[PDB]
């Protein structure tokens, strides 16, 4: 019946879903959530052999372990053990698209299983099998005898085996299919892979069971009461003593117990469901839950009979919330969120789509410690414990169905055709049976890029009728269709338009505001943090802020989806797109998080903590006014450390309590300070800081800070005078500066410093000549290819431009003698096919002191593109261990991401002053830096700079970070100007333009010293 | 203003002037001007200016030079944006080109006086024998700053001896979104701390 080519046929014998259970034979286990006696993993050793199709398959295996097969753990993907290869790739589907049909190279993984099974297993009830996820469509046999097939990759798919299965020895056999009509309906942007790589359980529930419960809470206007409504199904056979009851406990105390024989109200004609029964229970003050305060209650639904004996208990963890739409605004619990979001997809750098609970717990603590308060599922339903913890720990959830045909022409080709309903919808319906009673869940969505259908218009209207406590996104289609409750965009930009035909994305601010629209706007992606990522996210939060209906959004994303490989002598390093053979890949494309695989933060992180922060703060003379963004709760974990310094130098500190109720203010009163034994600038910085420890942080946890000059003290006294004098040297190659045990040296032909000695020391490597090119930013490059040029990005402008080969051509290098010091003086065109795009203009002059001041005014054309930089760059010879400046930091920070940075003296290890970003570019500059130091090296000016082991030429010549070699010496640039990052999207070009170096003329000034 | 420094220094093509001034008040430094003047075989006076601006001092009105010329001629001809008067948050209508009026139109008669008649993205300006190149906004007419200040109805101004030039490297904007609260937008404001800009000053 070739089933998996047929979107008509998405399972075969598959029992009905629901909401997670365990059949508890036993109250107190199932009020406790502890294991249950009735619930069993089969995950763990596994036998498995790889097939390149279906047709190879041999019958013997429904019977007999084959011999070839190896033993492996489940579950698991059976790429990340090597038996085929994944593959990246972002829009195009990796097959040819002709549905419903797939390759006739099928990969196919057989996976069998030798187990035993009580005896009391049998003997009574019913047991069944559970496959949490199987990707991406599979049949099962259990004893050599068929028993069904199941489709979608992302969902849990149950099989009875109770007339299959023997006490003692079974053994069960997987045939999965790599690819079936079902991966039509998954073209996500991410790895594409196959297995068993969610959890296997068998579960034994009696012959009369709770076959279903939902759980619902309504409250009065005040929130200050509830009423719970439980609505119990059973399949097997009906009896008039049969009963439900439903009790829900806050910890150790029940509140509330309800107790009914079955029989529904009545529906219509008919009747009323003979079957069910609906228990309400009044709550009183209920304690509400929040991603602040997740208080949550235990339901425990005992399916028994009437003289009291148990038959089971199911159960699950409730919280008291309303979500509602009103008058423009998503409201929880009455009050107005503002969405700090992450979209996270299931990733593991070892196991590919293998979830764990370290990991997700991982996750969600990084998550909260950077103030993140919901998570996007991008884009399927995910593990059943993810929702779990997100209901505990305190995030709010989109839910989404595992629907994406992103690769069709045009997108909504499938999602407009009534052929394909069906099968989407059991993939929306299939999610809300089995998640609607997680309070973590606040919004259901349709799935992700698949243009606007009507099956969506369907559907979107099915889950209304179905679950009214939730509202229904969904982005296709121009984002603001009549599928979704919330205009719910995707790089939508702040206040740029980007009108493309049918489907244009306006700013944010003016979405809102369009002819007749009321709705809120939450974007479901936007700062697409693709490597050096995240320039103008402050952009967003100041929006965010300012609008009420602009309620915030989901970043993209999580974390990097790269992979670990291998090299020949054993040394992991991180993989991408093409790295395994795939081909065609989308190469880097697949590596956008927010932290690496491994989880470690990459730079842009803090940004998004910063501007994410829960506390809003002014400065006006003395008074610091705090100013709370939590909506439930006062900050009863926190206090207020202040601390003022001059240039670096402590001053004055100290702390004080914060008792700030919800959406209040508190104002602190600094104390009188004793100003500054001189010149330079005083800086206050406050953080707000958590005593005591939480269920996701440490005592001690930094949740916000910010910054403020205060008073400046220009310095107008001169410094003494030196008897030294510097005298110079000229010959007809070169001009030299000699002073003391110092010597400069500048050579004629090119007009650069060639060479500094300290002592007998030589100092440079490289001779010190202008920049104005940085390797290229993944945001920088967008989708250009050497095959497939795009002229529009940033990096094709400027080649196109000639800026990477332009050539310095001297113009003038003269020396004079002043009074106390000699000024060289320079000016260099930097051209291309003759035109001049550079013009650089310097003076170098060395005292008595043995500084040397060096100004620069550069020219640059107004026709040629904006320049990444407008800096100076050398190899040093020395590399010291650690670098030391006075300016922002203490972690890496650009132009349009440099807010969460701050105004300090930080010391470092060189090697932090390099971003390991795993596709290598321009990486670790520090802002508004007004001195530098580097073993006997000190710069002073007002300047950006990096200083790392690796040229711009190595960085730009490099695809991978696991291939750089450190260089000898130290590469420093140092930047009077630099260009932004840009960020809003990593496909067209991004950086504002505030941000670009547009000005014509620029000036900029650095002392060089040695001390 | 107060004098930090002031030497000269013989090049080889040229004389070399450099100064540093500080202005104060009350004690308090308020902006400090550091320049240099290069005077070379052409005849030509090149002024390289860079000013601090204490970063907690109100940010200031204008950064530049002004002086009063003995010279009193009929008109002005600029390079740079015109041919009315324009300021940096009301200079979308000028239009960039070589423009040449009598003087008195590069005043404008306000009934209240003030600062009047900017000019901006000038690159070269022609006084009598004077010209001025560079990149700067700047006014020309009879009627010092001071006197703008003190004289509240235009018809009791009165044309001083000479010419006053004020040549401004940067110049705030005006604002108008009211007439009653601080209304110039913040990229107008002059807090960039550190300013620098440059002339040269040459005869015919
Ligand atoms: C490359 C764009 C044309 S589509 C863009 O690609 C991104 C790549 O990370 C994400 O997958 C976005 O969801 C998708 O819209
Ligand atoms: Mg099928
Ligand atoms: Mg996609
Ligand atoms: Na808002
Ligand atoms: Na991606
Ligand atoms: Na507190
Ligand atoms: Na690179
Ligand atoms: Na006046």
Same mark, same amino acid.
């Given at each position: 019946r070739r089933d998996w080519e047929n979107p008509g046929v998405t399972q075969l014998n598959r029992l009905a879903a629901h909401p997670p259970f365990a059949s508890w034979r036993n109250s107190e286990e199932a009020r406790t959530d502890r294991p249950s006696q009735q619930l069993r993993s089969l995950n763990g050793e596994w036998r498995f052999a790889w097939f390149p199709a279906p047709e190879a398959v041999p019958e013997s295996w429904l019977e007999c372990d084959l011999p070839e097969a190896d033993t492996v753990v489940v579950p698991s993907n059976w790429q990340m053990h090597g038996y085929d290869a994944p593959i990246y790739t972002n829009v195009t589907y990796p097959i040819t698209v002709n549905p419903p049909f797939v390759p006739t190279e099928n990969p196919t993984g057989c996976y069998s299983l030798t187990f035993n099974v009580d005896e009391s297993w049998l003997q009574e009830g019913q047991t069944r099998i559970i496959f949490d996820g199987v990707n991406s469509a599979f049949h099962l046999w259990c004893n050599g005898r068929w028993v069904g097939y199941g489709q979608d990759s992302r969902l849990p798919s149950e099989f009875d085996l109770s007339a299959f299965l023997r006490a003692g020895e079974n053994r069960l056999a997987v045939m999965v299919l790599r690819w079936s009509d079902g991966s039509y309906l998954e073209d996500q942007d991410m790895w594409r892979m196959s297995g068993i790589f969610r959890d296997v359980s068998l579960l034994h529930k009696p012959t009369t069971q709770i076959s279903d419960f939902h759980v619902a809470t309504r409250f009065n206007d005040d929130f200050s009461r509830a009423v719970l409504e439980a609505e119990v199904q059973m399949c097997g056979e009906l009896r008039d003593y049969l009963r439900v009851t439903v009790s829900l406990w806050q910890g150790e105390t029940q509140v509330a117990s309800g107790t009914a024989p079955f029989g529904g109200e009545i529906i219509d004609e008919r009747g009323g469901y003979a079957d069910r029964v609906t228990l309400r229970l009044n709550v009183e003050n209920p304690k509400l839950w929040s991603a602040e305060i997740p208080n949550l209650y235990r339901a425990v639904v005992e399916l028994h009979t009437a003289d009291g004996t148990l038959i089971e208990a199911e159960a699950c963890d409730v919280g008291f919330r309303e979500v509602r739409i009103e008058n423009g605004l998503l409201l929880l619990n009455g009050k107005p969120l503002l969405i700090r979001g992450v979209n996270r997809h299931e990733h593991h750098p070892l196991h590919g789509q293998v979830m764990d609970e370290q990991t997700m717990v991982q996750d969600i603590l990084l998550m909260k410690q950077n103030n993140f308060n919901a998570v996007r599922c991008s884009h399927y339903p995910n593990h059943p414990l993810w929702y779990t913890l997100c209901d505990r720990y305190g995030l709010y959830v989109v839910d989404e169905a595992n629907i994406e045909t992103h690769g069709m022409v045009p997108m909504n080709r499938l999602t407009d055709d009534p052929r394909w309903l069906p099968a989407m919808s059991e993939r929306v319906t299939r999610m809300v049976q089995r998640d609607r009673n997680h309070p973590s869940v606040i919004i259901w969505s349709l799935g992700n890029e698949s243009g606007h259908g009507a099956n969506h218009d369907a559907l979107y209207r099915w889950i209304k009728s179905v679950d009214p406590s939730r509202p229904v996104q969904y982005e296709g289609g121009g984002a603001d269709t009549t599928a979704t409750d919330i205009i719910c965009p995707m790089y939508a930009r702040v206040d740029e338009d980007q009108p493309f035909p049918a489907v244009p994305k306006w700013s944010i601010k003016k979405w809102l505001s369009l002819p007749g629209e009321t709705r809120p706007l939450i974007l479901c992606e936007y700062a697409h943090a693709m490597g050096n990522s995240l320039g103008g996210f402050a952009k967003y939060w100041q929006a965010f802020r300012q609008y009420p209906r602009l309620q915030g959004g989901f970043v993209w994303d999580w974390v990097d989806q790269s992979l670990i490989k291998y090299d020949e002598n054993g040394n992991p390093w991180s993989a991408y797109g093409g790295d395994f053979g795939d081909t065609p890949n989308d190469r880097q494309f697949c590596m956008n998080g927010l932290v690496f695989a491994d989880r470690t933060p990459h730079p842009a992180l803090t940004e998004a903590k910063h501007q994410q922060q829960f506390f809003q703060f002014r400065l006006s003379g003395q008074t610091i006014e705090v100013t709370s963004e939590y909506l439930f709760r006062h900050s009863d974990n926190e206090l207020l450390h202040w601390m003022v310094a001059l240039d670096g130098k402590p001053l004055a500190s100290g702390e004080v309590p914060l008792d700030v109720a919800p959406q209040g203010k508190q104002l602190i009163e600094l104390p009188e300070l004793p100003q500054p034994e001189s010149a330079g600038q005083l800086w206050l910085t406050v953080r707000v800081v958590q005593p005591n420890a939480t269920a996701w942080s440490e005592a001690g946890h930094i949740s916000a800070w910010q910054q403020w000059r205060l008073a400046e003290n220009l310095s107008v006294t001169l410094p003494a005078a030196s008897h030294a004098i510097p005298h110079l040297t000229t010959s007809e190659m070169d001009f030299c500066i000699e002073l003391g045990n110092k010597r400069w040296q500048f050579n004629r032909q090119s007009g650069f410093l060639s060479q500094m000695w300290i002592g007998d020391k030589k100092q440079l490597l490289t001779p010190l000549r202008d920049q104005f090119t940085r390797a290229p930013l993944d945001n920088d490059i967008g989708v250009s290819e050497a095959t497939r040029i795009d002229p529009n990005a940033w990096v094709e402008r400027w080649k196109a431009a000639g800026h990477y080969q332009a050539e310095a051509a001297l113009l003038q290098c003269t020396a004079d003698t002043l009074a106390d010091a000699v000024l060289i003086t320079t000016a260099h065109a930097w051209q291309h096919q003759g035109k001049t795009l550079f013009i650089s203009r310097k003076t170098y002059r060395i005292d008595g002191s043995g500084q040397m001041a060096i100004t620069v005014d550069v020219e640059v054309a107004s026709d040629t593109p904006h320049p990444a930089?407008?800096?100076?760059? $050398?190899?040093?010879?020395?590399?010291? %261990?650690?670098?030391?400046?006075?300016?922002?930091?203490? @972690?890496?920070?650009?132009? /349009?991401?440099?807010?969460?940075?701050? &105004?300090?003296?930080? /010391?470092?290890?060189? *090697?932090?002053?390099?971003?390991?970003?795993? +596709?290598?570019?321009?990486? =670790?500059?520090? $802002?508004?830096?007004?001195?530098?130091?580097?073993?006997?090296?000190?710069?002073?000016? /007002?300047?950006? &700079?990096?200083? !790392?082991?690796? !040229?711009?030429?190595?960085?730009?010549?490099?695809?991978?970070?696991?291939?750089?070699?450190? %260089? %000898?010496?130290?590469?420093?640039?140092?930047? =009077? &100007?630099?260009?932004?990052?840009?960020?809003?999207? *990593?496909?067209?070009? !991004?950086?504002?333009? %505030? +941000? @670009?170096? !547009?000005?014509?003329?620029?000036?900029?000034?650095?002392?060089? $010293?040695?001390?």
């Open positions: 930089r407008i800096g100076l760059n $050398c190899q040093l010879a020395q590399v010291a %261990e650690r670098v030391n400046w006075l300016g922002l930091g203490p @972690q890496e920070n650009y132009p /349009d991401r440099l807010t969460a940075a701050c &105004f300090d003296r930080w /010391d470092l290890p060189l *090697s932090d002053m390099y971003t390991p970003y795993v +596709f290598p570019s321009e990486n =670790g500059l520090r $802002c508004g830096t007004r001195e530098l130091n580097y073993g006997p090296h000190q710069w002073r000016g /007002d300047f950006q &700079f990096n200083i !790392s082991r690796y !040229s711009q030429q190595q960085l730009m010549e490099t695809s991978h970070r696991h291939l750089l070699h450190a %260089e %000898e010496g130290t590469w420093l640039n140092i930047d =009077g &100007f630099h260009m932004g990052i840009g960020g809003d999207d *990593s496909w067209s070009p !991004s950086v504002s333009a %505030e +941000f @670009q170096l !547009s000005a014509g003329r620029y000036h900029y000034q650095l002392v060089w $010293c040695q001390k």
